[model samples]
Target chain A: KETLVLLYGGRSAERDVSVLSAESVMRAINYDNFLVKTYFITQAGDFIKTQEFDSQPSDKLMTNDTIIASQKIKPSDIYEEEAVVFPVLHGPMGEDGSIQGFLEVLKMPYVGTNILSSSVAMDKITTNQVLESATTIPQVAYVALIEGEPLESKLAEVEEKLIYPVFVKPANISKAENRTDLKQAIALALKYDSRVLIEQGVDAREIEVGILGNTDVKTTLPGEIVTMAIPAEIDPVIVEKMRDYAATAFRTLGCCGLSRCDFFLTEDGKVYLNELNTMPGFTSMYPLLWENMGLSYSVLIEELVSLAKEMFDKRES
Target chain B: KETLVLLYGGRSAERDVSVLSAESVMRAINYDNFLVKTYFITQAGDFIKTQEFDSQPSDKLMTNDTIIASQKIKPSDIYEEEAVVFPVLHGPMGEDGSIQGFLEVLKMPYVGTNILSSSVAMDKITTNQVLESATTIPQVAYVALIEGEPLESKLAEVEEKLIYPVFVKPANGISKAENRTDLKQAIALALKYDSRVLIEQGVDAREIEVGILGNTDVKTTLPGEIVTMAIPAEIDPVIVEKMRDYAATAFRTLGCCGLSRCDFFLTEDGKVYLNELNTMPGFTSMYPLLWENMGLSYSVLIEELVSLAKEMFDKRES
Candidate 1:
């Protein structure tokens, strides 16, 4: 039987969340045709071999004793057995091109987006720049500030272009809040990244679309937050536009596997592309969005595995 | 003493060139503070231990016996000794973001551009988009064709926007030339990569490139104009300045560090079009040769890159 390695619990702020998501995936995974091996990355960045779940482990577990089974494993061990890697990781070290790049160097056919796309999507400034150049997608007015730029001058430029109550965020999308505390906000954002993005805030609804497939595209029906609507009570035309724009952003950015395109739908019929989560929250809206589209969470897991293999083979060819 | 691990050779067509470049760097590297360890990557992508030159190898030797001395080594061995890596390899696996990203995951300070910058600069289509968005730099007119797009329509689009004798190239770059016949053949050859291709208009111009260095603040010197002859081509001062400015803007916009050689095509009428950005441009005279004019030798250029790598790492962690 083919072995599918489940890589999870990354050294990021999202470690606990990743552990929970990985547990859900491990339980939901189909065990008939493949053997699933678990590998947990400690918060300290050590890769440890963990329990191999043939079927599903009972109970929700988070401790190292229940998860980790071996002392340590070299990253090269992934190549030891001919296996496909399902990197169920999130945030900086995991989602931000670093792990993807590591996988690329290892020539492993893993899940999710490639290095360039992941890095670009992780970086707000780069993503905005690429979207502005490639598509006619609407985005919020923003200022991309690099370190060493005179703070006063940059703040003045931001105030001139973007109005007060601007959202000051690190280009990496770490810390963000709408605040009039421009100087303190800039300092706080800069602490996370040398480059910061200050954007004009909008009073809008949060809408997310799930994207699947490689090269050719497939998107889940648009879903909205804080609404009683099933298909996001927006106009049919607007829904179609959102779906089309999300796929375009994915393809244009050369994303593979899956991505969740987040958007800001204003009260005035304006749609602003907020961000593209290359490795989005799997347990949250992503699985729910698919489930709403008649695809179950368990089937979504299987589909992603098949897609990972397909993407891997496609690249090798 | 701080260790400087020299990573060379790669699974690319430029492997031989990388070997030569590595040898040159090994010879020029200052040994007083660095215990240089050489690692060779085979054409099949195996990393092997080569000679450890504590005081430089003698007399331009090029043999497997002298170069490949030890057994294959794991890439993780790079971090085992707490050494900074100077990957002298070029082309796909080397210059592209793969190796840089690998180093990033390893948390090692590497000499050259980071993953995002290296990958962006390596991809022609992506580079064009970033440059077009960030700067007003002049670029060659081109059509970016993605896979699944109808070739007939794309070719028609290319013809509509660009004149014939257009150069067809893969986003990573492979083939080029002028002629409708050659264009079709080039397209077929490039389609093997099959993801995306760029067809650019042919320009009658001289090739000039500028070298840029730094992490935050960048500096660009007068460029070396490539010519048919061995000596560098001379250009009008204003044209030279314009080319330099475009190179600097391209480098800065991409957030490149350590070094990048931005190639430009200068027309006889003084108009310049940005051609490409090479993250790991050949360490030939084009770089060190031009730096020679600015009172820095090849050895000094290598040393400066090492220092820049440490500085970039310090900033990243801080």
Candidate 2:
């Protein structure tokens, strides 16, 4: 049986989200074909080895203490012969290419995007730049600001380019706010990151799509988050463009394994690419979107594992 | 005295170059105000603790094993309270933002560019895209190709857009080549480092550079070489301004800090296009030359970088 090392619980604000996602993934993986070893990363950035299971481990038995198998191990210790790492981690140390680079240094095969793509996708400014260069995917007008710049001058630039109702965001942080409180918003955004991006606000529907495969790209049909309605009835033409743009963005940014592309669709049938999550939340919209596209949650996990191995083999060659 | 970790010797083609640079830096640093810690990264990526020098260490003593003071340490072990890391290393594990990201995860103040900018600047394709978005900087016409794509199609595209004698280079690799045989050799060499390669039209031009400093507000001197020529005279003032403008744009777009030597190719007829941005561009040519021109020494330059590190850290923390 092939060994699958599951890395989870990262040092990000979304640690809980990653833990939940990892639990869901652990419960759903194919136990018959693969032996699973779990490694938990503390919020403090320590790596602790947990339980090893040939069969599905119960949630109760998977708690940090109950499953603690080893005291501490270096991040490089995650490497094992003939094993592929499924880094079911979100944000910062996990999703931000730190672990990916570590894996690369170790010459280990792991899931998701490479170092460059992951870091680019994680930063909003870099993402917009790459997307603008690669595709005609519309995005909200915004200004990127680094720390120590005159806030008044940047605010003036933002006000001049975008309308009054603009959204201020930190390029590195996941939080954002629309401006009635532009100064406070900028301050809050800057608190999270030195680089801040103030985006023009838009009244648009949130649409998402899942991209699978490496090199030869494949994307799922567009799905909408029904805050108001189910199934997100939309023009087939728009759906096609969303899927096409999603794949293009993935390929152009050189993303591998799987990614979830988020988009904003305005009322006038225009779509703006919001962001691409290299390691999107697994238990949330990602798995459901795949499920809606006739692929089950477990099947999607399997596909990602296969894709990870494929990408690893290709990179090795 | 603030602890300054001088990280050098990485796993890259430029490993020896890094060692030379680090040795130079170690000799010149102001030891009175700063505590110097030398950490050598082996070609195999193992971090070994070396000499902690208050006075200059001899060249012979600085060899890998003679200076080895401790067993192998994890990359994270280089972190210390109120210490700044000057990763004088270059290429893959060093200049490509791998160490930058690793330092970030450890919440330490490291000199030079952040993870995003370092990685972007290291990649030719991504650097070009960011520059194109930020400014009207002219660049050589090029085609980016990934592995699995039809080479014939990409080759045809390159031939169509760019003139013959185009240069083929890997996005991450520092090597380049022109012509058919050289192109094939270049492709094979690049593929060893990256799956994606960029081929560009070769232009005959002299390399001009500008050194940029600061966090938010950046300052750039005109251009020069050899440390004495402050405002190196070029074709004309307009051409000089254009090169300086392009360099600043590349710096701001990529969000570099402390320093980056922006290289531009200036033709005899006055046409210029941006080339590459070296985050840690050979400490000798970059720092000492700038110091000579601006009346600052290697010691002052190191101080400025340490200050920038503190400022950057405070900004991120706040």
Find the candidate with the highest lDDT and give its number: 1
Candidate 2: DockQ? 0.39
Model 2 clashing residue pairs (backbone): none
Q: Candidate 2 on B194-237: residue-level lDDT in tens?
A: 56788888776777777777776676767764324434644578
Report per-candidate DockQ: 0.54, 0.39
Which prediction has the highest TM-score against the true structure? 1
In model 1, the runs with Cα more than 4 Å from the true position are A59-70, A146-157, A172-180, A187-194, A227-230, B59-70, B148-153, B172-192, B228-233
lDDT of 1: 0.77
Worst 10 residues of 1 chain B by lDDT: B60-69
State the C-alpha lDDT per candidate: 0.77, 0.76
Interface Cα RMSD in Å, per prediction: 2.0, 2.8
TM-score of 2: 0.86
Leading candidate by DockQ: 1
Worst 10 residues of 1 chain A by lDDT: A171-180
